[PDB]
mmCIF file of C-alpha atoms and ligand atoms in Angstrom:
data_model
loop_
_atom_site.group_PDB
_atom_site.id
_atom_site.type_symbol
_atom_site.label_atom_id
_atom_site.label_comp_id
_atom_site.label_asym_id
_atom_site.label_seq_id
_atom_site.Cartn_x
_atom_site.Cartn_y
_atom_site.Cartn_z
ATOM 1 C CA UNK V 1 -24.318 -95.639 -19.058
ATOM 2 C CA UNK V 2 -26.303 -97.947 -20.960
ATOM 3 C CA UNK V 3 -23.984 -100.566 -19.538
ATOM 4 C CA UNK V 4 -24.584 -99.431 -16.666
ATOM 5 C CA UNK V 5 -28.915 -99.191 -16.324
ATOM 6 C CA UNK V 6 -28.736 -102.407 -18.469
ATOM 7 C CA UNK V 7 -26.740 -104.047 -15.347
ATOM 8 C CA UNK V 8 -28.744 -102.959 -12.833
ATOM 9 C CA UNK V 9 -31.901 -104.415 -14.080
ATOM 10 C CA UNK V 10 -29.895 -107.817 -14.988
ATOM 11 C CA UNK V 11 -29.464 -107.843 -11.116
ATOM 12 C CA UNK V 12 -32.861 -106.652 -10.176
ATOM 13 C CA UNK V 13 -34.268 -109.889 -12.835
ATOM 14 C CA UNK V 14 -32.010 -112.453 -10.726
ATOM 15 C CA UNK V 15 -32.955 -111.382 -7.782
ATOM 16 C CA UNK P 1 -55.307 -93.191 -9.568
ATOM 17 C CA UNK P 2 -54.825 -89.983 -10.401
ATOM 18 C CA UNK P 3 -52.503 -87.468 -8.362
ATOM 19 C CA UNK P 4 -52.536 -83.974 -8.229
ATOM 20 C CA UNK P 5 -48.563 -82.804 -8.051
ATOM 21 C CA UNK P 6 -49.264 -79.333 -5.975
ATOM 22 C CA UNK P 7 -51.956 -78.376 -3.996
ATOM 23 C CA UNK P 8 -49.677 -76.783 -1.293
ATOM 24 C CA UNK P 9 -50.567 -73.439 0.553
ATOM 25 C CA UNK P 10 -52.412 -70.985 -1.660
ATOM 26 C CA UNK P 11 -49.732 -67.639 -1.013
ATOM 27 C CA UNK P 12 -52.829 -65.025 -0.929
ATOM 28 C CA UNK P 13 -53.457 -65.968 2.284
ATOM 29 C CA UNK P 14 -50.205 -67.097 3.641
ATOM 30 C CA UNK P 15 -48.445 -64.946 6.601
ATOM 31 C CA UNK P 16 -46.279 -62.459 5.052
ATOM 32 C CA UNK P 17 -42.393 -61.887 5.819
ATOM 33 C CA UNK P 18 -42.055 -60.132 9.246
ATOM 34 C CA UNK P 19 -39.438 -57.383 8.146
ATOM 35 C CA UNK P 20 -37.571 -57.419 11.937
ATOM 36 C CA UNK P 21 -34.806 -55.759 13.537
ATOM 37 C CA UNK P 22 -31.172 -55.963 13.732
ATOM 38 C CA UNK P 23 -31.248 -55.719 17.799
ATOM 39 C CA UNK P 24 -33.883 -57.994 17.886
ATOM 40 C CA UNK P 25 -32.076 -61.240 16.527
ATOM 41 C CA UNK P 26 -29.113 -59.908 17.844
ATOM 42 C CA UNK P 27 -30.573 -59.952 21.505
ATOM 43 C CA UNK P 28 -31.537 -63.722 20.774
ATOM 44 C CA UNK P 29 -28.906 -65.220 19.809
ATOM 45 C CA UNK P 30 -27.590 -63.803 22.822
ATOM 46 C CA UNK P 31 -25.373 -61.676 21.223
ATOM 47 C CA UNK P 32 -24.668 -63.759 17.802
ATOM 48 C CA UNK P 33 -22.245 -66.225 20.330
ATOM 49 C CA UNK P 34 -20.481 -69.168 19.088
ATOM 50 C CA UNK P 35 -22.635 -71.452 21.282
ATOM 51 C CA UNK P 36 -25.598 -70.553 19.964
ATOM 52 C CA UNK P 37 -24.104 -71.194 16.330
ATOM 53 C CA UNK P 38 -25.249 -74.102 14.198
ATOM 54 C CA UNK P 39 -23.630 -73.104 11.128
ATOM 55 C CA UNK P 40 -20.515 -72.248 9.805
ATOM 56 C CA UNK P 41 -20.446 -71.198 6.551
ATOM 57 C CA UNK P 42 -20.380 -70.889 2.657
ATOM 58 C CA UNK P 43 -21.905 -67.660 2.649
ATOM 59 C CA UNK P 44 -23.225 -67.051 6.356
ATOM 60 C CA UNK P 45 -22.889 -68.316 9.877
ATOM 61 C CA UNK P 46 -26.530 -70.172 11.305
ATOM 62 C CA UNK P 47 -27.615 -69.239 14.929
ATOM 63 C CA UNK P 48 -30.269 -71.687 16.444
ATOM 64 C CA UNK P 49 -32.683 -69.040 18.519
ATOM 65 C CA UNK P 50 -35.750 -68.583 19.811
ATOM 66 C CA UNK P 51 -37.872 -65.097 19.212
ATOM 67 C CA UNK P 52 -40.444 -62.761 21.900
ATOM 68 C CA UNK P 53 -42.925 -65.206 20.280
ATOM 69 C CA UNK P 54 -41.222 -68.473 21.662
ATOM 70 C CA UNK P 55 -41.407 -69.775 18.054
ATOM 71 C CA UNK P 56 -38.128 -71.883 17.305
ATOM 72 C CA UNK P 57 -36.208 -70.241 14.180
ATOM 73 C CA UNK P 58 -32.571 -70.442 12.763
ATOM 74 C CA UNK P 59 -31.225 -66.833 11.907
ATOM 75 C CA UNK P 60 -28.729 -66.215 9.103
ATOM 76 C CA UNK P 61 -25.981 -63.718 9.282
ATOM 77 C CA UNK P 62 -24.793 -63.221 5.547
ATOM 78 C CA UNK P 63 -21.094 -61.952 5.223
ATOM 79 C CA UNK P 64 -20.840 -58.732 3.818
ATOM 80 C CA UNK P 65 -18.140 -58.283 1.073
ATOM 81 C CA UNK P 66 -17.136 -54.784 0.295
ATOM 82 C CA UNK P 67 -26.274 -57.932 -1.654
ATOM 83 C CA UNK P 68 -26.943 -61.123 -3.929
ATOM 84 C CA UNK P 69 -27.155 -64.172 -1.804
ATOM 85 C CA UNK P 70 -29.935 -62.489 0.218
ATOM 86 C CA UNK P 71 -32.085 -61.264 -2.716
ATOM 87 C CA UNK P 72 -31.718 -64.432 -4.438
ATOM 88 C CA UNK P 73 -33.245 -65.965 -1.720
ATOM 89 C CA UNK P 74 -35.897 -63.030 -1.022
ATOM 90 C CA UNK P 75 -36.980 -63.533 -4.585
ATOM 91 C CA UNK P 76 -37.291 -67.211 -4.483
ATOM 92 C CA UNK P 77 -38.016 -68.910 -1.056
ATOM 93 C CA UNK P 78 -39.199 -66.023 0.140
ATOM 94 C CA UNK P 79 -41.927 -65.708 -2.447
ATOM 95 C CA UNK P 80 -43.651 -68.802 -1.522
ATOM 96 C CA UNK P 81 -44.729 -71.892 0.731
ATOM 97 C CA UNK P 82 -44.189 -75.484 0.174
ATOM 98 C CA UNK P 83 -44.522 -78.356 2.593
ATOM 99 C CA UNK P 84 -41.355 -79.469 1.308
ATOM 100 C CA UNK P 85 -39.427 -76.397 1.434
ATOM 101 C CA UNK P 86 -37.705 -74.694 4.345
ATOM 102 C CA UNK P 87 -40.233 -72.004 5.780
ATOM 103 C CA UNK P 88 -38.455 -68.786 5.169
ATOM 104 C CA UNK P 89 -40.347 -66.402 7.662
ATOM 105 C CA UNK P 90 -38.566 -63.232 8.335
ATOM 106 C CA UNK P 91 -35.598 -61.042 7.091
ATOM 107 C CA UNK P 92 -33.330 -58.189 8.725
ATOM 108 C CA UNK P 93 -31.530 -55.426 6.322
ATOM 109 C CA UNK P 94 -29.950 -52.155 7.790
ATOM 110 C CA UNK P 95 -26.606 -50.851 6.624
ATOM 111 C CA UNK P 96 -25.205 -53.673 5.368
ATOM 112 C CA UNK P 97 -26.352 -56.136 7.370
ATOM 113 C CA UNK P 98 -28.614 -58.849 5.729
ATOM 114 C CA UNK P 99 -30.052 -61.617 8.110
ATOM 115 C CA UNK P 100 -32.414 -64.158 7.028
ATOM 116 C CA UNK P 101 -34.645 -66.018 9.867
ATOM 117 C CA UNK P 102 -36.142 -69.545 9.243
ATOM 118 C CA UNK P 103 -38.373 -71.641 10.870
ATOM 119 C CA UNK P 104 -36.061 -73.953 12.836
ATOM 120 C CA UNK P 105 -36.315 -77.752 12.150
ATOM 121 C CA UNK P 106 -36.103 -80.194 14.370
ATOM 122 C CA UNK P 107 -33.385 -82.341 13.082
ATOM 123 C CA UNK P 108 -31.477 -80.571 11.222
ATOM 124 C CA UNK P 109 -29.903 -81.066 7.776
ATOM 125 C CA UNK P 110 -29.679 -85.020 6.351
ATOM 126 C CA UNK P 111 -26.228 -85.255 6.232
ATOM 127 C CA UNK P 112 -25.727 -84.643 10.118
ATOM 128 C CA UNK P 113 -28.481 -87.436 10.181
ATOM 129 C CA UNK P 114 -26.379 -89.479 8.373
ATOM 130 C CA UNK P 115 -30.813 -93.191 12.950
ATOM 131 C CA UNK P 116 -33.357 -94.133 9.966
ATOM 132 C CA UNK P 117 -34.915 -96.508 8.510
ATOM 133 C CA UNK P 118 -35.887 -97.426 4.780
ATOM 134 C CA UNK P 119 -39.322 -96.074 4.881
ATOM 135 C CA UNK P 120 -38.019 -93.369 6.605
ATOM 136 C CA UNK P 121 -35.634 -92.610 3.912
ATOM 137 C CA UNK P 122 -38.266 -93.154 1.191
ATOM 138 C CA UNK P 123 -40.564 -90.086 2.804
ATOM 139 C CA UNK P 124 -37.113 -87.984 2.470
ATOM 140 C CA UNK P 125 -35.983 -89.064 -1.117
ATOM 141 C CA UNK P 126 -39.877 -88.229 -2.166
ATOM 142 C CA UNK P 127 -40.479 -85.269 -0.496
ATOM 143 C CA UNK P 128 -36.940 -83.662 -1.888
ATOM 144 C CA UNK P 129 -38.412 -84.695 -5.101
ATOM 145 C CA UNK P 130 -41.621 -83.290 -4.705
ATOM 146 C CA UNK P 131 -40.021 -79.861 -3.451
ATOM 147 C CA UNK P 132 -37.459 -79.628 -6.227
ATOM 148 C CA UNK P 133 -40.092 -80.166 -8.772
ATOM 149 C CA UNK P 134 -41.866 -77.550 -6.798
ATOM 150 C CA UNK P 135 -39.036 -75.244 -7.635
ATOM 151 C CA UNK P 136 -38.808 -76.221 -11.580
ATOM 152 C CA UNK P 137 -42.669 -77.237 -12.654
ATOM 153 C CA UNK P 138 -44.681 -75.005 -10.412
ATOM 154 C CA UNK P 139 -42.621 -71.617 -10.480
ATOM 155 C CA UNK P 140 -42.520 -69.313 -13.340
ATOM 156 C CA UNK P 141 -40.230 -68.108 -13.696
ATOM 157 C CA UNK P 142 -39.047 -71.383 -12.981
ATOM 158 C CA UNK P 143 -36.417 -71.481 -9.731
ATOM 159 C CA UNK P 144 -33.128 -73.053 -10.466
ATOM 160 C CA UNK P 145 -31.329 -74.135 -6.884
ATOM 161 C CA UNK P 146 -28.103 -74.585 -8.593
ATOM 162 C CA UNK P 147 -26.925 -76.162 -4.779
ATOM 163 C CA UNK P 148 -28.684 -79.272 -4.102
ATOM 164 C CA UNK P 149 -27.106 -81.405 -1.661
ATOM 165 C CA UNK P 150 -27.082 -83.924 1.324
ATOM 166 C CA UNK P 151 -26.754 -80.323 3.843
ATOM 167 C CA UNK P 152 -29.458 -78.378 1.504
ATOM 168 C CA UNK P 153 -32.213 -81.257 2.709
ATOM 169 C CA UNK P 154 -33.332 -80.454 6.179
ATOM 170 C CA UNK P 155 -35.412 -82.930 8.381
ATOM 171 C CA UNK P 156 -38.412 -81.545 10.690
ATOM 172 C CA UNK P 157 -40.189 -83.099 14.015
ATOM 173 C CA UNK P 158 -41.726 -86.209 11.441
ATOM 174 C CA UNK P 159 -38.503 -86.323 9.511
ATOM 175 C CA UNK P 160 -40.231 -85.010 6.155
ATOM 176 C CA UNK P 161 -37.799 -83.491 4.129
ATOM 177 C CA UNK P 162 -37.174 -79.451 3.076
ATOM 178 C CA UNK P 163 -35.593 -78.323 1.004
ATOM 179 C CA UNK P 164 -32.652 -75.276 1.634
ATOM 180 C CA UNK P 165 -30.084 -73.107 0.765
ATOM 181 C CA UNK P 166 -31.606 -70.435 -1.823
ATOM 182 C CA UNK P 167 -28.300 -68.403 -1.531
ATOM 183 C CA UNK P 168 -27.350 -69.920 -5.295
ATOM 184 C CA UNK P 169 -31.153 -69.766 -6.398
ATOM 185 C CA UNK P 170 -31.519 -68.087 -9.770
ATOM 186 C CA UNK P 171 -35.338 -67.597 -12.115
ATOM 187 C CA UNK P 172 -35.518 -68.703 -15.457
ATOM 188 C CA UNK P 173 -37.978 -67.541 -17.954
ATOM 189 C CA UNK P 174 -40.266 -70.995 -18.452
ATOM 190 C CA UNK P 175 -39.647 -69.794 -22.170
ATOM 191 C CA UNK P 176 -36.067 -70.647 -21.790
ATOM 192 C CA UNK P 177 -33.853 -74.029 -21.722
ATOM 193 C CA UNK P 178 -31.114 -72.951 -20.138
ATOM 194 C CA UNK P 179 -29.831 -69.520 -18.344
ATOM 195 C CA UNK P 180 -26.702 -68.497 -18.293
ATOM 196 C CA UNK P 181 -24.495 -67.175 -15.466
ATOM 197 C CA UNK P 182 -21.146 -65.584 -14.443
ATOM 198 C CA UNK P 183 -19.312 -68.327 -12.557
ATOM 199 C CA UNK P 184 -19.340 -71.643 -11.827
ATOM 200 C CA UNK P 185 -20.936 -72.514 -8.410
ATOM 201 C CA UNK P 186 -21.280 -76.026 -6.558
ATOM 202 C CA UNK P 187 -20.776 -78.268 -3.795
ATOM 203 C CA UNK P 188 -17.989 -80.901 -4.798
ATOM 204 C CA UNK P 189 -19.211 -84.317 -5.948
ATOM 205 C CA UNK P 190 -22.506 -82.960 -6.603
ATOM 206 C CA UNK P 191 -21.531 -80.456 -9.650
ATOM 207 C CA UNK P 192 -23.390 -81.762 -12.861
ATOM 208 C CA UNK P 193 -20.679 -82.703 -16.506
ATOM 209 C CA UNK P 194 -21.974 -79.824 -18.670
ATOM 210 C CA UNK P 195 -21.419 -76.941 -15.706
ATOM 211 C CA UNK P 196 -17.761 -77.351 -16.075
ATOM 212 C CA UNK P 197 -17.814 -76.879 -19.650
ATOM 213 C CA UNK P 198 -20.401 -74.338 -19.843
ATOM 214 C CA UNK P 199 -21.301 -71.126 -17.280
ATOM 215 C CA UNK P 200 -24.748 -72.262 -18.011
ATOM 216 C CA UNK P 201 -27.581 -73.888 -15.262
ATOM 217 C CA UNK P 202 -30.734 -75.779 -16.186
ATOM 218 C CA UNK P 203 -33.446 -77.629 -14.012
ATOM 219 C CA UNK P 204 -31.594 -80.768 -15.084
ATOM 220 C CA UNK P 205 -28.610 -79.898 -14.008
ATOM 221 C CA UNK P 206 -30.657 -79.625 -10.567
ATOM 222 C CA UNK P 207 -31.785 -83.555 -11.232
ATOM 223 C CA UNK P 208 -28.278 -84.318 -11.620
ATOM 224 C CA UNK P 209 -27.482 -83.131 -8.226
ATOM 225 C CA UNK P 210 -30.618 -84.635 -6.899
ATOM 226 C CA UNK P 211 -29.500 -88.029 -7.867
ATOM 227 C CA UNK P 212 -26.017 -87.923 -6.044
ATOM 228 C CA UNK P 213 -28.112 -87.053 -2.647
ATOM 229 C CA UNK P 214 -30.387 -90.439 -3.418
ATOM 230 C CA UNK P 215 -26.561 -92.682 -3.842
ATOM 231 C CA UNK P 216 -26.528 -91.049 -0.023
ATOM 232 C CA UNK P 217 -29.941 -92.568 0.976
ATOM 233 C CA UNK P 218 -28.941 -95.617 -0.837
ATOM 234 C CA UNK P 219 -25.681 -96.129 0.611
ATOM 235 C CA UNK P 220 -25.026 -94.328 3.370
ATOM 236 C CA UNK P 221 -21.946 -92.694 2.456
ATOM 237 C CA UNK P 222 -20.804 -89.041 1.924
ATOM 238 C CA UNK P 223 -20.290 -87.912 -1.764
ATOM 239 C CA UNK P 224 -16.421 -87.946 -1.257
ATOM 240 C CA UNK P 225 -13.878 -88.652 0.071
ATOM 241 C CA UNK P 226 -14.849 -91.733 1.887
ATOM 242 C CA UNK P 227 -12.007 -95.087 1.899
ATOM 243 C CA UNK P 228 -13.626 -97.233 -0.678
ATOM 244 C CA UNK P 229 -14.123 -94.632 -3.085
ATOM 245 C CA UNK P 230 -10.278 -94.275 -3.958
ATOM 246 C CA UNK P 231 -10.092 -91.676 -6.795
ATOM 247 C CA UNK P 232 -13.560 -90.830 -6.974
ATOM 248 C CA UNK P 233 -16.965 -89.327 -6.087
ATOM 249 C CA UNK P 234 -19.663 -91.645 -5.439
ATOM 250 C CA UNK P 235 -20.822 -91.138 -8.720
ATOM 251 C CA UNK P 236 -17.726 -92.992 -9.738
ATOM 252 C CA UNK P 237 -17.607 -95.206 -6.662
ATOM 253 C CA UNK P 238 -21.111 -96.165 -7.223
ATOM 254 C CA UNK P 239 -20.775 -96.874 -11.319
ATOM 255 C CA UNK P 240 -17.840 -99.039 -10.965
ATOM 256 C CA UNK P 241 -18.703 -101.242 -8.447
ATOM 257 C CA UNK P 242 -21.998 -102.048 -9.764
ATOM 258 C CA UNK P 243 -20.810 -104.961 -12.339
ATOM 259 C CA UNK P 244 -19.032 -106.634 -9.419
ATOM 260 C CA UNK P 245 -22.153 -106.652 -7.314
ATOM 261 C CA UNK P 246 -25.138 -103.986 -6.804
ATOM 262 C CA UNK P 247 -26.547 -104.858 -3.338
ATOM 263 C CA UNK P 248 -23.206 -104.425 -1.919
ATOM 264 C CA UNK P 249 -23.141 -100.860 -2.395
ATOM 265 C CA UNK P 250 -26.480 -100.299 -0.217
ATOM 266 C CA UNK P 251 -26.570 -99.168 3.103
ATOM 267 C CA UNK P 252 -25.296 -102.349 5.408
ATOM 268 C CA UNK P 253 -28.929 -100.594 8.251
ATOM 269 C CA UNK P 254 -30.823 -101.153 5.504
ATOM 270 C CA UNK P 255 -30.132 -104.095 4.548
ATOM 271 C CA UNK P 256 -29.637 -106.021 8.417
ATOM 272 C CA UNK P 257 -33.573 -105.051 8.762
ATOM 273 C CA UNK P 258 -34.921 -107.069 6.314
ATOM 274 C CA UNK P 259 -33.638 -109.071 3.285
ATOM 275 C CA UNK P 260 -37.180 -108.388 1.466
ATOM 276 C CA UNK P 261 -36.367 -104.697 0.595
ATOM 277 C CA UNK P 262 -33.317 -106.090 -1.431
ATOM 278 C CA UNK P 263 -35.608 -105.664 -4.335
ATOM 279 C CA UNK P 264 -37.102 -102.583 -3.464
ATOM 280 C CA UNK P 265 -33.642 -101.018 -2.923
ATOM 281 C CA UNK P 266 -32.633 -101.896 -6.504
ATOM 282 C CA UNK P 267 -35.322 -100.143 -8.318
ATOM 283 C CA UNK P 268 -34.983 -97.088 -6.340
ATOM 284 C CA UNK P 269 -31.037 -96.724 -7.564
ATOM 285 C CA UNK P 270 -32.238 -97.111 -11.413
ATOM 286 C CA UNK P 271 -34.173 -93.403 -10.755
ATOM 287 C CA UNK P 272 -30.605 -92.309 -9.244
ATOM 288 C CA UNK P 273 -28.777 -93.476 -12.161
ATOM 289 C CA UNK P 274 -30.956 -91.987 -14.533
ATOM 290 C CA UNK P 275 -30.506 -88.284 -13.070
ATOM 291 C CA UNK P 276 -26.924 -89.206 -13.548
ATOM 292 C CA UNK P 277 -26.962 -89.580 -16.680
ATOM 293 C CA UNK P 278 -23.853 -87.637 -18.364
ATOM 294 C CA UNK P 279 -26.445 -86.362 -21.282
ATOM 295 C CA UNK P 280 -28.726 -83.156 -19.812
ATOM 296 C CA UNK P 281 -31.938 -84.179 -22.241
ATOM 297 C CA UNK P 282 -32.138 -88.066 -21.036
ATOM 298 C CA UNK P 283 -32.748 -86.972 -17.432
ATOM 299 C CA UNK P 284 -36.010 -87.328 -15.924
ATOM 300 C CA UNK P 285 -38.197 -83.983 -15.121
ATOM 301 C CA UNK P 286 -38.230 -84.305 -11.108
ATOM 302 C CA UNK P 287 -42.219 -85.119 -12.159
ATOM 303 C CA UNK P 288 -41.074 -88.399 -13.747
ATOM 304 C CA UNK P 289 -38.965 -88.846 -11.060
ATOM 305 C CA UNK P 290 -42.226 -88.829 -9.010
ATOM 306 C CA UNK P 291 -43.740 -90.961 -11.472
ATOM 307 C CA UNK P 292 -40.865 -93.383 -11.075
ATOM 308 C CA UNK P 293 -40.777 -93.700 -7.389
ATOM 309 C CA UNK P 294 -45.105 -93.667 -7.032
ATOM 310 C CA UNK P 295 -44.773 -96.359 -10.139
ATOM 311 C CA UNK P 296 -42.372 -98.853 -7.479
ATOM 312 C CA UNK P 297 -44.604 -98.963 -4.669
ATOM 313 C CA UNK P 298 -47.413 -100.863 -7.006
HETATM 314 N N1 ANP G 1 -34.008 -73.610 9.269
HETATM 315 C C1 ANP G 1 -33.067 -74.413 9.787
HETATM 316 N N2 ANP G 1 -33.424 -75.308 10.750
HETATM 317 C C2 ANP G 1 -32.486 -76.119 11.254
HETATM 318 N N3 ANP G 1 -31.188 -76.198 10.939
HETATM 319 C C3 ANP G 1 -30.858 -75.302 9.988
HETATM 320 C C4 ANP G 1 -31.716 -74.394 9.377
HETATM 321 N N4 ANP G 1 -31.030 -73.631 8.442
HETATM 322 C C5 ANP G 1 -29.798 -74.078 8.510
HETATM 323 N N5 ANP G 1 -29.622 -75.092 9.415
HETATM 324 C C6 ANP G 1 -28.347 -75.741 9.732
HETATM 325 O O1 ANP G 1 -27.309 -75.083 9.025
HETATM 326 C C7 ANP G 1 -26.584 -76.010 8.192
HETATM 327 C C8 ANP G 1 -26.530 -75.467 6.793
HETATM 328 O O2 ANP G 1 -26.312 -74.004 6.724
HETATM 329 P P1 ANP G 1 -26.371 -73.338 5.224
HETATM 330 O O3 ANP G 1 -25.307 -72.298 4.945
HETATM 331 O O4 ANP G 1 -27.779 -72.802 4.934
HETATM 332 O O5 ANP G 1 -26.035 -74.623 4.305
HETATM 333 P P2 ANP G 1 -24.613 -75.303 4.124
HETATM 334 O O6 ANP G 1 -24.559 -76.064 2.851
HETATM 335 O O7 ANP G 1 -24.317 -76.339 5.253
HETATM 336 N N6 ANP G 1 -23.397 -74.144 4.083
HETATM 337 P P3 ANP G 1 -21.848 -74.811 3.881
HETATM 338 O O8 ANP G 1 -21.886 -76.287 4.134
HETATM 339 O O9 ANP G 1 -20.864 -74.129 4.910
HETATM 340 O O10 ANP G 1 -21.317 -74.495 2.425
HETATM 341 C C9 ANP G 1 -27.260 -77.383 8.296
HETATM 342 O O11 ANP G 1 -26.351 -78.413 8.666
HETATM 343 C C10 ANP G 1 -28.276 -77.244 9.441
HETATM 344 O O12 ANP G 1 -27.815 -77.902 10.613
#
């Protein structure tokens, strides 16, 4: 969920 | 810049639905034969054809039980013209017969497809938006689709998408939230939390399903029962994964192209997770999910 959205944009950040 | 959502085919003038005859589309599809069928079916069989006119169209034969799938989809696709839905153009009804004839496009429905590319697969995730919000924003009553899904999208001859399948379709006062129904209906993997603890459908229940047919686009991979998954839809297959790694879960064609879409790849499966969200209200309108995708590409 939030987990889950809050993830995601860790990744897109690295990236 | 400003966009204006719909601006499709003013209905006044658009060609009416040719009522036509039984012996007609039975003639054509040379005698409804297996080898001229494209569909086997839910609630009809699909025979590719072509009419007297030489126009291309797929004709529906609708199983008679001893009339609701056809008038739901009289009174909804029937009623009007979209660029992104499925052109609807005649109907047959004696006895109890009830045929519906379509415009016949080119490439059939996205999940057969599924020989393209990412910007190909934008146009399709963006023009199912733009048709479902058709459906819920520019309707009213509003049209609920209650069956959206990977063989519901259909490709034409520039691989646009259309939206299909009105057999489900229900109208919902734009006064209400929610309408309420008799049973529960859905395609598996696609079926929305709150419909299996409610007989109730929504417009957001329609993003939900919308969402599970981007994971497709995204990755490549049927809504279940595919070997990775294990236990679960992709909606589970896709959730789990993620904290392991994201880009692993997108669509190896994709990917092989070009390394620089990595990025663009990512933001596109935040909309998807958001009309998966398990809560109704925190789903984006499919306007906002326009929003979201047009708000990307800048
Ligand atoms: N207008 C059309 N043009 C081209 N192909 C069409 C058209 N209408 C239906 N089809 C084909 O028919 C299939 C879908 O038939 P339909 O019953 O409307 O949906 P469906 O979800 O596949 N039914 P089912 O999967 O058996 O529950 C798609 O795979 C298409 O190949």
């Amino acid at each position: 969920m939030e987990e889950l959205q809050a993830a995601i944009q860790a990744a897109i950040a690295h990236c | 810049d400003l966009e204006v959502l719909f601006q499709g085919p003013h209905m006044a003038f658009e060609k009416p639905l040719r009522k036509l005859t039984f012996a007609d589309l039975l003639q054509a599809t040379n005698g409804f034969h297996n080898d001229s069928l494209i569909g086997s079916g839910g609630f009809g069989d699909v025979y590719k054809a072509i009419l007297k006119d030489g126009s291309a169209v797929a004709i529906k034969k609708l199983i008679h039980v001893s009339d609701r799938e056809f008038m739901a989809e009289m009174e909804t696709i029937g009623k009007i013209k979209h660029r992104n839905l499925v052109p609807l153009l005649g109907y047959c009804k004696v006895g109890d017969e009830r045929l519906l004839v379509y415009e016949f496009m080119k490439y059939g429905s996205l999940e057969d497809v599924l020989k393209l590319n990412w910007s190909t697969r934008r146009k399709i995730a963006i023009g199912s938006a733009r048709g479902l919000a058709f459906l819920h924003h520019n309707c009213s009553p509003h049209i609920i689709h209650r069956d959206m899904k990977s063989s519901n999208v259909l490709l034409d001859e520039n691989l646009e998408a259309r939206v299909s399948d009105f057999g489900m379709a229900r109208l919902m006062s734009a006064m209400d939230t929610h309408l309420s129904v008799s049973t529960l209906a859905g395609t598996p993997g696609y079926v929305p939390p709150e419909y299996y603890q409610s007989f109730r459908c929504s417009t957001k229940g329609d993003v939900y399903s919308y969402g599970v047919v981007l994971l497709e686009l995204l990755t490549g991979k049927r809504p279940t029962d595919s070997p990775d998954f294990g236990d679960n839809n992709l909606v589970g297959w896709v959730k789990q994964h993620a904290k392991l790694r994201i880009s692993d879960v997108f669509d190896p064609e994709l990917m092989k192209e070009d390394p620089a879409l990595e990025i663009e790849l990512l933001q596109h499966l935040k909309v998807a997770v958001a009309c998966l969200d398990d809560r109704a209200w925190r789903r984006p309108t499919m306007v906002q999910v326009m929003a979201m995708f047009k708000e990307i590409q800048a």
